[PDB]
Amino acid sequence: GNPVICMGHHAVANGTMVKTLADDQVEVVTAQELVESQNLPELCPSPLRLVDGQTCDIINGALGSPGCDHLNGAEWDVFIERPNAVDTCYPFDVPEYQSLRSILANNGKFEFIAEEFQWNTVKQNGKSGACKRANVNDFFNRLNWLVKSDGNAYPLQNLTKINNGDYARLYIWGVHHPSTDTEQTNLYKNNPGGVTVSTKTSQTSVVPNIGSRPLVRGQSSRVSFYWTIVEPGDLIVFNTIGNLIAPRGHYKLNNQKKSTILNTAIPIGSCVSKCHTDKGSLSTTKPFQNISRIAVGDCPRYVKQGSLKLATGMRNIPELFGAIAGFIENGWQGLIDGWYGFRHQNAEGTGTAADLKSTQAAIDQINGKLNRLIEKTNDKYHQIEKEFEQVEGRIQDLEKYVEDTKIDLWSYNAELLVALENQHTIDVTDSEMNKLFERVRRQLRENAEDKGNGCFEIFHKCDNNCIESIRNGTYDHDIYRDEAINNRFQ
Ligand SMILES: CC(=O)N[C@H]1[C@H]([C@H](O)[C@H](O)CO)O[C@@](O)(C(=O)O)C[C@@H]1O
Ligand SMILES: *[C@@H]1O[C@H](CO)[C@@H](O)[C@H](O)[C@H]1NC(C)=O
């Protein structure tokens, strides 16, 4: 009525606080951070193909502005566009600028092919001192500036390019418009001008506009750029009685467009990562991140919280079933080779040993319990714009509201998931502690009594081999039962 065997669990000097459904902060032995809050100060060129626009934004690269020659033939997963990019040619605008930029970015490549346009008597290749290439008056190398004849001759242009190809074609054309009325008549003389680009099923006609506007690049004049898409079977008719900034061919479009554009000043480095934010690339296995809503590729999901700790171990009590932090007073810092174990005392001395089965059962149910849930990847490429220079009204409100709605919902999911999992992890570890206790209780039958602190008083001599027989499940209660019963009740 003298040896004692105690069942218990590990502990460390100082653990990590986590949140559950029932508790704001409970200390557990180990935990894992789920929110990535650190970014690399560079962008990774692998495994995704990054293309640096450098001084050239993507519109100018499609126009063929000066300094945008490297973008010729370029292929990208993510077009990297610099915020300090510069206009290096004739002052222009694009109605539906955003939509053209999106189409260009998503298509993923600059692959121009040449086509010969036989312009009547009009002269071609008009240039300007605004668009100087090596201080030589030049022009958008994808565009043809059509001017009068020498002999004062603006004739009607009607030529048609037919798409009998295997792909959809992208034509970019423009409409010049001047400053007064002499303008227009010393450059196309017909006044007003006008252009009509059309397909089999679609029209587009432009009325040039003439007036004073600021001296940008030293000109009071502008060009307005449009685009037209021609799918296999359709075609495109160029009508102008003046002012048409003709195309020199068409861009080839991919059937499936899987690319996008990232606008950032961050330099391109030599790291490896499949996730890119406008603050830099992310190198992580965490499921969430608080770095930027603007994120492309194989990225963690963006959330509002700066920290969410997932418990990966039991409650930490140094020195639901009510075992851990319950009838078991505290954990054992000395138990370093297991989560649960046995501590005994008999006539020969004392000992602490780990229990493998219970330890392994807990680890199996807790280790990486998230990988089976929050999927793996989340591969997002072309999305929507998420930050804006100036308000625009209706469309911009919706774009912002959609993203704000998405973020709140995922932040909610992240919060609930962690509290839920942690609640479950704590219950599992408490559960396994008391399964171990109950296992040993059942082994001992009538030979021992529960002392109330996770310990059994064993009512017979139990030497080291006897103790080990209890720990490894070979203890035969019938051997000691006579001795034990006599000690218990007499
Ligand atoms: C095709 C053509 O006529 N190009 C000429 C332009 C246009 O007349 C204006 O840009 C129209 O506003 O004007 C220049 O003075 C310039 O800006 O360098 C000379 C140039 O040769
Ligand atoms: C992201 O979280 C970290 C703390 O983990 C914090 O320092 C940082 O400011 C957060 N980023 C935000 C709030 O944009």
**Structural biology method used:** X-ray
Tell me, yes or no, whether 219 and 208 share the same domain: yes
Tell me, yes or no, whether 177 and 287 share the same domain: no
Distance (Å) from CA 286 to ligand 2 centroid: 15
φ/ψ bin of 194: left (φ > 0), alpha (ψ from -120 to 50), beta (otherwise): left
Tell me, yes or no, whether 319 and 396 share the same domain: yes
Tell me, yes or no, whether 70 and 31 share the same domain: no
Q: Which atom of ligand 1 is nearest to the CA of 179?
A: 12
Distance (Å) from CA 122 to ligand 1 centroid: 16
Distance (Å) from CA 43 to ligand 2 centroid: 20
Pocket test for ligand 1, best of 89, 124, 128 (most atoms within 8 A of CB): 128
Q: Is the CB of 149 under 6 A from ligand 2?
A: no
Tell me, yes or no, whether 125 and 232 share the same domain: yes
In terms of Cα–Cα distance, which of 13, 18, 15, 11 is closest to 33? Answer: 18
Tell me, yes or no, whether 262 and 161 share the same domain: yes
Tell me, yes or no, whether 209 and 338 share the same domain: no
Tell me, yes or no, whether 90 and 167 share the same domain: yes
Q: Which atom of ligand 1 is nearest to the CA of 129?
A: 18
Q: Which atom of ligand 1 is nearest to the CA of 145?
A: 1
Domain boundary pick from 243, 266, 289: 266
Alpha-carbon distance of 114 to 371, in angstroms, equals: 51
Domain carrying residue 457: 1-48+267-490
Tell me, yes or no, whether 274 and 327 share the same domain: yes
Tell me, yes or no, whether 303 and 273 share the same domain: yes
Distance (Å) from CA 128 to ligand 1 centroid: 5
Cis peptide before 192 (omega within 30 of 0): yes
- Cβ neighbours of residue 270 closer than 8 Å, sequence gap 6 or more: 42, 44, 45
Tell me, yes or no, whether 235 and 347 share the same domain: no
Number of domains in the chain: 2
Domain boundary pick from 266, 293, 314: 266
Q: Closest-lying ligand to the alpha carbon of 123?
A: 1
Residue with CA closest to ligand 1 atom 7: 128
In terms of Cα–Cα distance, which of 115, 55, 109 is closest to 79? Answer: 109
Domain boundary pick from 247, 266, 285: 266
Tell me, yes or no, whether 294 and 245 share the same domain: no
**Domain CATH code at residue 232:** 3.90.209.20
**Total number of residues shown for the chain:** 490
> In what helix (H) or strand (E) does residue 354 lie, and over which residues does it extend?
strand 349-354
Distance (Å) from CA 446 to ligand 1 centroid: 108
Written in H, E and C, the secondary structure of 177-220 is ECCCCHHHHCCCCCCCCEEEEECCCCCCEECCCCCCCCCECCEC
